[PDB]
Amino acid sequence: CSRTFITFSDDATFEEWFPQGRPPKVPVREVCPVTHRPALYRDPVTDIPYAT
């Protein structure tokens, strides 16, 4: 048989890699109060996600 047993357990920086993010998606349709359409860009002056 032939196996692999890489080990770094003398520190926590290794053990910290696996749970790094595990985060889901939360960019959603930023509907605008003009046309209710697939919002395109956020206005840098009003910070509103306008589409049209």
Binding site: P44, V45, D47
Partner: peptide
């Protein structure tokens, strides 16, 4: 269509305006 015209070139040489100062956190 966007060739800079001499009229607009002369007009732009005027007093400018300051940029906006946005701070909205609402709808």
């Amino acid at each position: 269509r966007h060739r800079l015209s001499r009229r607009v070139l002369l007009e732009v040489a005027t007093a400018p305006d300051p940029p906006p100062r946005p701070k909205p956190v609402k709808m």
